[PDB]
Design a protein around this ligand. Structure first.
Ligand SMILES: *[C@@H]1O[C@H](CO)C(O[C@@H]2O[C@H](CO)[C@@H](O[C@@H]3O[C@H](CO[C@H]4O[C@H](CO)[C@@H](O)[C@H](O[C@H]5O[C@H](CO)[C@@H](O)[C@H](O)[C@@H]5O)[C@@H]4O)[C@@H](O)[C@H](O)[C@@H]3O)[C@H](O)[C@H]2NC(C)=O)[C@H](O)[C@H]1NC(C)=O
Ligand SMILES: *[C@@H]1O[C@H](CO)C(O[C@@H]2O[C@H](CO)C(O)[C@H](O)[C@H]2NC(C)=O)[C@H](O)[C@H]1NC(C)=O
Ligand SMILES: *[C@H]1O[C@H](CO)C(O[C@@H]2O[C@H](CO)C(O)[C@H](O)[C@H]2NC(C)=O)[C@H](O)[C@H]1NC(C)=O
Ligand SMILES: CC(=O)N[C@@H]1[C@@H](NC(=N)N)C=C(C(=O)O)O[C@H]1C(O)C(O)CO
Ligand SMILES: CC(=O)N[C@@H]1[C@@H](NC(=N)N)C=C(C(=O)O)O[C@H]1C(O)C(O)CO
Ligand SMILES: CC(=O)N[C@@H]1[C@@H](NC(=N)N)C=C(C(=O)O)O[C@H]1C(O)C(O)CO
Ligand SMILES: CC(=O)N[C@@H]1[C@@H](NC(=N)N)C=C(C(=O)O)O[C@H]1C(O)C(O)CO
Ligand SMILES: CC(=O)N[C@H]1[C@H]([C@H](O)[C@H](O)CO)OC(C(=O)O)=C[C@@H]1NC(=N)N
Ligand SMILES: CC(=O)N[C@H]1[C@H]([C@H](O)[C@H](O)CO)OC(C(=O)O)=C[C@@H]1NC(=N)N
Ligand SMILES: CC(=O)N[C@H]1[C@H]([C@H](O)[C@H](O)CO)OC(C(=O)O)=C[C@@H]1NC(=N)N
Ligand SMILES: CC(=O)N[C@H]1[C@H]([C@H](O)[C@H](O)CO)OC(C(=O)O)=C[C@@H]1NC(=N)N
Ligand SMILES: CC(=O)N[C@@H]1[C@@H](O)[C@H](O)[C@@H](CO)O[C@H]1O
Ligand SMILES: CC(=O)N[C@@H]1[C@@H](O)[C@H](O)[C@@H](CO)O[C@H]1O
Ligand SMILES: CC(=O)N[C@@H]1[C@@H](O)[C@H](O)[C@@H](CO)O[C@H]1O
Ligand SMILES: *[C@@H]1O[C@H](CO)C(O)[C@H](O)[C@H]1NC(C)=O
Ligand SMILES: *[C@@H]1O[C@H](CO)[C@@H](O)[C@H](O)[C@H]1NC(C)=O
Ligand SMILES: OC[C@H]1O[C@@H](O)[C@@H](O)[C@@H](O)[C@@H]1O
Ligand SMILES: OC[C@H]1O[C@@H](O)[C@@H](O)[C@@H](O)[C@@H]1O
Ligand SMILES: OC[C@H]1O[C@@H](O)[C@@H](O)[C@@H](O)[C@@H]1O
Ligand SMILES: OC[C@H]1O[C@H](O)[C@@H](O)[C@@H](O)[C@@H]1O
Ligand SMILES: OC[C@H]1O[C@H](O)[C@@H](O)[C@@H](O)[C@@H]1O
Ligand SMILES: OC[C@H]1O[C@H](O)[C@@H](O)[C@@H](O)[C@@H]1O
Ligand SMILES: OC[C@H]1O[C@H](O)[C@@H](O)[C@@H](O)[C@@H]1O
Ligand SMILES: OC[C@H]1O[C@H](O)[C@@H](O)[C@@H](O)[C@@H]1O
Ligand SMILES: OC[C@H]1O[C@H](O)[C@@H](O)[C@@H](O)[C@@H]1O
Ligand SMILES: [Ca+2]
Ligand SMILES: [Ca+2]
Ligand SMILES: [Ca+2]
Ligand SMILES: [Ca+2]
Lengths: 389, 389, 389, 389
């Protein structure tokens, strides 16, 4: 074992192949499947695992009642073998909390959870399954982080965190970790005006994080991080193809340097994009209003050209089905000459959209890049809400 | 440590001993057992494992309703320790799809799943637990493969695949894989007119695949593969003993080079044979019409002799019980001077044969050869359907 | 790793400490616990495991109905980590059948199961978890074995098997195994008139088997095996303290060379003794009629002296509670200068004795020698049968 | 792997961070969770596990009825991976009994359990998963031990055990183990008048145990053990800050050398403190009468100064929520220059306090120190009792 470095280029991607699906809600109708939300995947030299925020109750359990609620002393980050559903019998507790990130540096995994009350939350940073570092809230307002994997280079792993209003200017820091210990802290710099829930991946010695501006913008902020100089810049996706949820119709021109406003009724959702000049893909919900459907759109020069639009699409979840959060990960230990993009989509069931049940949970689907021109179908959740009534 | 070489000859077989039985439906009446179909086993240097295509639901779950249906986005190939029943707690997800194959090359396991819509399925080829290769559909008609184990020699693992009509001429390929990467693709050549669901094994550097002609033959096609040369031939099993389901009565002579047609109402079932001159055995369901009973027939020179008939028979499942698919496997890593034949029978319960239940699923029995003359009995599923009403 | 050699003497025993208890019926009332019977324990260099004959159903399952029945195609030898209850999620299938034995030789574990119809049963012998040898029925009447562990010395593992009447003269053999292969077969010789269900242990290069005579004696037969020469003798336990169940009052004298008859209503139960001069301990059910209670009795020279009586006693299960089978095992790999005797008692719940339920199952308790004078209480099952009604 | 040596000082602690929370009652409402009480945590070179005394029945099981009872043949010490709820499917059985301690010495784990009747209990001492030693009751009155982890130094693991009255002068011993073998046995010396349920840690070659006086004191006895010399002293914690439950209001002065009487209705609860000069912290329930709430109090010189009061506080469980036992553990194998203090709180649910249910159980929370000033919230159990009615 060695520290991962990020000096390979991104792979060429012409379509997306099915990597994994857990069918958690279908299985959780009967077997003992934990209630969750904010899932993702993360890899290490050995393979890949699913991660999510448990609600500290099973789906059929009476305590599922009220699981719409975001933050409780009963939530923890759990991980498990990619593909299986999360039960109390197959899940590792990574840390305790209601907001998380995790990543493997080539040697060991670092996992980070926030917990506590809204005015007094704290992060505990674990490395090798051991607690290393604690960080108190600096702004006293729901200290929080990515909800998807971080990225490490040469032992250095940056993590974007935010503390402050959901609906106004907040205080975002980039913290640089090595073996769970803080190497540097940096205030957000650049033109991104609001930063939440960054989806991050590395390629070519650089880490790109594509985020949620929950304040004003229906276009997504992008933070470029040098993990060697331990510095960063920020701005917005240039493309007119707007990828936040609640968004207006796509304008004729996007805006590299300011939030483009509009959309009703939701201020944001976690999302992602891979930005590689011509080899660029943007994900989004199919609905402009709601967390339903999911589509991948190849938009050459999305990161630099305000006029860029799709040259190809793939429907991942059709617009008759609920989606939710979406984020980036890559298996950096694959036996290839390039880093192949992968993404997951969180498939939210129950409240608020389906309120014939008392709970909110989700399942997971995950896909990676193919150089081939693969056919596709919808990878929706597939559970019958009527079975839970 | 090393690549499996197919050097050894086949062991003499005079009868069949019990290897494993999972009792999955009996257990699944209570415990949390996954709905499945299309099982098989496969071994590696450490031991044997059971495989099946999950339906993404447990047997007692309400989602088990409608599981007669073959293809959905909720199926995946799962594997588990031989003899246990498949639950969400003890299963490994090998890949995502509704047709599969799997084998170990002596170093690592290759696993292959097709998924996607009928007019646009794709294969994802997995090696050592990672996705290596994707293959688009070549004929836009349910790209599909073996549904039992492949076989490797010096790192080369041939896989037989088909795309095209179930009731007409289709497009079959032999794909030769080494570490999940395509070394060669051949089009099917020879006298087999239709090819599905091949059951394969190796001995003395030759791989034989005994398959299902869903188009015409109640005789089974036989593909013979040289994995060094990476070439094949194809024809039909010569014996007058027909082993497909829905077959007519055995004629006076079989045909080596052309289908023996007939029988009603079903076109085919996956089956297998071991072919080694004198030491040749054929499995078939006992009913010539439906998937019930299972028998093993020692049919000397089945592969060469149009007049060859049984000189012994072992009842595996009595004709009062449901069977289903059957397939070949060998423990190539046995401490033995020969490769001993083994097989499984899938014990299908529920629909369409038992319509008092809303689901279709199965359990597994597995047996291997013995030089001795062993007594026997029926190894039927053993669940009571009245319990599920 | 090296072959186990039986070079240590038995440790001195003056009472019995608790080793394990799985509370399988209490736990199986809600959790998913397999119906079992004929349990035992067996150790290897890494530790000890619990073993039993599963009925291929869980205890609360509808298929638990009819589990009084001894032989079916749905039974398998299962082993799990000592002190756990056996559920579908934690048990390894050792082999398939309804009579077993198992032992580790210092390198790998050998397991043996019989399956088949009464007149045509067979043994399959496994070594390192792979099948090695098959042995067909020699007398066409329920080929059967120890139902507790076998013992090895320099890789030679003898096994006692019987084929023939339960109620009359049968054909017993002693089979000498090494790595699953048969080295010698001997027919039973000496004074034991009937042999079943041998509980065997080794100390100082000699193996002793304490068996069940189902035909005549309420005294237990004793086979002495030389694992090196591969020869044996047999007679009866000399002591007047009668240990089989159904048995009459203890007579004034025992008989070394012939059975002591009487008792009602039942012909026999599996049981055991440690036999070592002054250091001799006889288990038996407290009740002389039924399978209730269990007591240990120190009877010096029980083996050789027809007049030997108890000098102390420890109640293991009180006579108000159900017992069942009992048997010998030792951790031959403990860091001790002697081999310390252990035993278990099968704690049978349900039919025939408790007919308010439709099933038969058991739980387990295991205790080992102490050189100390330990207090004791009853280790009865502890499930409340009314919960199951 | 070598013997752990208590060579490092205790870390500076200013605040407590969340380590783990198993949410076992919430999860056990549906999923098959073992009823437990008397939990703790213990670490080894590889990670930390949770430990509890199981009741040999699951939480929703009908046998949960009556689990208020402290002692039965159906209890066992179980260990599981930290963060998980204890189920039949993920727990190791450490030993059998109703009182326990456990600790790892850097090489292997020693685990000790007492079982038996009140007047004839015995301890079994286990090492590396094998039983090594047995200790009979010396006073015929419920031989019993710490209910939390022991501590080892150069292979020598002291354990505090008591035998004799709960409400009068009892007979306490300090037993020094090495690889499960007795090195030395001392009778309690010093001014502690009654000793139960010691919580022990190590720093700079010294072991401190903060115990429970069930007889007269609302202050806590403290034993200071030299593991190299194998000698101890005892007294009471000096501070006016009384930390047993039932206690009176805190007095003007404490008492280092005699119990301080008073409080109602409870004679005692298991508790803990870390004593390190200015860096000293005392746990106690928030309620003086009852096992509700839990608070950490930084009391400089608590160990030497009768007038020492709190300089800071952390609410661990609010006084509207039930707590229970509490105890000390340290990850001695952390990659840190100091030994960092951790503790758990047993969060008791059911009887006697909540008698709309027929059972008594608990969940667990654990926390470790921080040099930081971190915010906090209440880590209550989180289950709704109405759901179990
Ligand atoms: C966010 O959480 C952070 C944690 O870093 C906050 O910080 C804590 O802040 C407090 C000041 O607000 C701390 O307080 C002080 O306590 C010491 C000693 O306290 C104990 O002893 C005295 C005398 O015996 C009692 O009167 C105290 O009674 C308070 O605490 C107990 C719980 O133990 C509670 O049950 C009582 O009702 C009562 O509120 C107590 O037992 C005093 O000498 C001092 O004057 C002051 O009160 C605390 O030390 C500090 N903790 C840590 C850890 O840093 C902050 O409060 C939170 N911020 C926000 C915005 O909420
Ligand atoms: C980046 O990480 C790679 C992958 O390990 C790396 O390593 C190799 O490069 C050297 C020469 O520079 C070799 O000759 C090795 O054969 C290569 N090793 C492997 C395992 O592929 C780079 O050195 C790392 N670069 C930096 C800047 O850290
Ligand atoms: C506690 O239990 C132990 C063990 O059973 C015990 O010892 C036995 O004593 C009785 C009566 O004196 C006997 O006759 C047995 O032979 C003794 N057995 C052993 C194994 O030593 C004590 O009697 C019991 N002590 C108390 C106080 O009950
Ligand atoms: C799963 C589902 O029913 N999805 C609806 C979808 N359906 C179709 N286009 N058919 C259309 C939208 C939408 O674009 O508004 O999103 C959904 C919707 O109605 C809302 O979000 C409003 O609450
Ligand atoms: C399991 C079972 O009972 N199977 C039936 C079998 N049974 C007996 N011969 N007992 C008889 C036949 C048959 O004669 O065609 O095949 C089976 C059949 O499918 C049908 O009869 C019609 O569905
Ligand atoms: C567990 C239990 O209650 N067992 C009964 C037992 N009970 C008591 N001694 N209390 C009495 C005896 C006996 O000693 O013969 O045997 C048992 C019995 O059922 C029968 O004898 C009739 O079949
Ligand atoms: C968890 C809970 O409700 N606990 C009660 C709590 N008070 C309140 N939460 N209101 C505080 C006390 C107390 O300080 O004595 O008393 C507790 C109590 O109910 C009893 O002692 C009854 O025996
Ligand atoms: C820390 C936290 O509670 N984050 C919230 C997050 C959120 O409120 C915002 O992004 C607004 O600031 O939104 C959502 C969401 O569904 O929009 C889920 C997250 N839930 C959890 N991570 N548990
Ligand atoms: C890919 C696919 O759906 N294959 C079918 C297969 C089939 O339809 C034919 O062979 C005719 O083309 O038949 C059966 C069958 O039971 O006959 C099950 C297989 N199901 C699954 N593999 N999932
Ligand atoms: C092979 C077989 O069925 N053995 C029987 C055994 C028995 O019948 C005799 O000893 C008489 O010959 O009795 C019992 C018994 O409880 O008496 C259980 C065993 N059950 C099982 N091993 N499965
Ligand atoms: C051996 C035993 O039963 N110990 C009791 C203990 C106790 O009774 C006393 O400390 C008085 O001596 O109190 C408690 C308690 O909740 O107070 C739990 C323990 N229960 C168990 N450890 N099982
Ligand atoms: C993943 C992929 O290739 N998707 C393409 C998409 O661009 C499209 O528009 C369609 C045109 O018929 O064909 C398909
Ligand atoms: C008939 C049909 O649907 N063809 C699809 C097309 O839409 C497409 O996108 C291509 C690659 O994705 O696969 C094929
Ligand atoms: C103490 C003892 O007997 N050790 C044995 C030795 O006799 C032997 O022959 C060898 C293989 O048989 O393994 C070891
Ligand atoms: C769900 O939770 C609600 C608010 O806490 C409530 O009061 C309701 O009764 C409860 N419902 C069920 C069915 O548990
Ligand atoms: C509770 O246990 C007691 C003691 O045996 C009892 O009798 C009662 O019926 C049990 N209650 C239930 C609901 O089982
Ligand atoms: O959707 C983006 C693209 O998809 C494909 C075709 O339909 C294109 O002509 C279109 O621009
Ligand atoms: O069927 C195989 C053979 O089995 C034996 C007899 O049943 C023969 O008459 C038969 O040919
Ligand atoms: O059980 C036999 C022995 O047990 C002990 C005492 O009760 C003795 O009187 C007796 O000889
Ligand atoms: O003679 C009857 C018998 O002959 C031979 C076989 O081919 C069987 O299929 C058939 O039933
Ligand atoms: O097929 C000829 C003969 O051999 C085989 C068995 O199935 C027999 O019943 C059959 O009649
Ligand atoms: O191979 C099984 C077969 O062999 C024998 C015959 O009596 C048949 O009726 C039976 O089905
Ligand atoms: O008297 C015989 C003697 O031996 C033993 C036990 O069964 C005792 O209860 C009894 O006292
Ligand atoms: O359990 C009751 C019973 O056990 C046995 C003997 O030790 C008897 O003395 C006693 O009466
Ligand atoms: O000063 C009031 C406060 O003093 C200190 C503690 O001992 C508390 O219990 C008490 O309430
Ligand atoms: Ca937005
Ligand atoms: Ca056909
Ligand atoms: Ca008898
Ligand atoms: Ca007290």
């Amino acid at each position: 074992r060695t520290f991962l470095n990020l000096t390979k280029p991104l792979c060429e991607v012409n379509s997306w192949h099915i990597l994994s699906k857990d069918n958690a809600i279908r299985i959780g109708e009967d077997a003992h499947i934990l209630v969750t939300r904010e899932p993702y995947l993360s890899c290490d030299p050995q393979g890949c695992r699913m991660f999510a925020l448990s609600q500290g109750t099973t789906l059929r359990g009476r305590h599922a009642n009220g699981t719409i609620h975001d933050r409780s002393p009963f939530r923890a980050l759990i991980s498990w073998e990619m593909g299986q559903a999360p039960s109390p019998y197959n899940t590792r507790v990574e840390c305790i909390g209601w907001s998380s990130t995790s990543c493997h540096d080539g040697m060991s995994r670092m996992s980070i959870c926030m917990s506590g009350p809204n005015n007094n939350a704290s992060a505990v940073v674990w490395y090798g399954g051991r607690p290393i570092t604690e960080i108190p809230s600096w702004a006293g307002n729901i200290l929080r982080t990515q909800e998807s994997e971080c990225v490490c280079h040469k032992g250095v792993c940056p993590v974007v965190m935010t503390d402050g209003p959901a609906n106004n200017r907040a205080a975002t820091k980039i913290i640089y970790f090595k073996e769970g210990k803080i190497q540097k802290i940096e205030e957000l710099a650049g033109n991104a005006q609001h930063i939440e829930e960054c989806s991050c991946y590395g390629a070519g010695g650089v880490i790109k994080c594509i985020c949620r501006d929950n304040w004003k913008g229906a276009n997504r902020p992008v933070i470029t991080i040098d993990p060697e100089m331990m510095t960063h810049t920020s701005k917005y996706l240039c493309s007119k193809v707007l990828t936040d949820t609640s968004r207006p119709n796509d304008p004729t021109n996007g805006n590299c340097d300011a939030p483009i406003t509009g959309g009703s009724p939701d201020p944001g959702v976690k999302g992602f994009a891979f930005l590689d000049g011509e080899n660029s893909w943007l994900g989004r919900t199919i609905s402009k209003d709601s967390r339903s459907g999911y589509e991948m759109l190849k938009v050459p020069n999305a990161e630099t050209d305000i006029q860029s639009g799709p040259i190809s699409n793939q429907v991942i979840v059709n617009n008759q089905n609920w989606s939710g959060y979406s984020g980036a990960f890559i298996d950096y230990w694959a036996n290839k000459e390039c880093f192949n993009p992968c993404f997951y989509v969180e498939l939210i069931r129950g409240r608020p959209k389906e309120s014939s049940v008392l709970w909110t949970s989700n399942s997971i689907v995950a896909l990676c890049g193919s150089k081939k021109r693969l056919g596709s179908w919808s990878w929706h959740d597939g559970a019958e809400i009527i079975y839970f009534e």
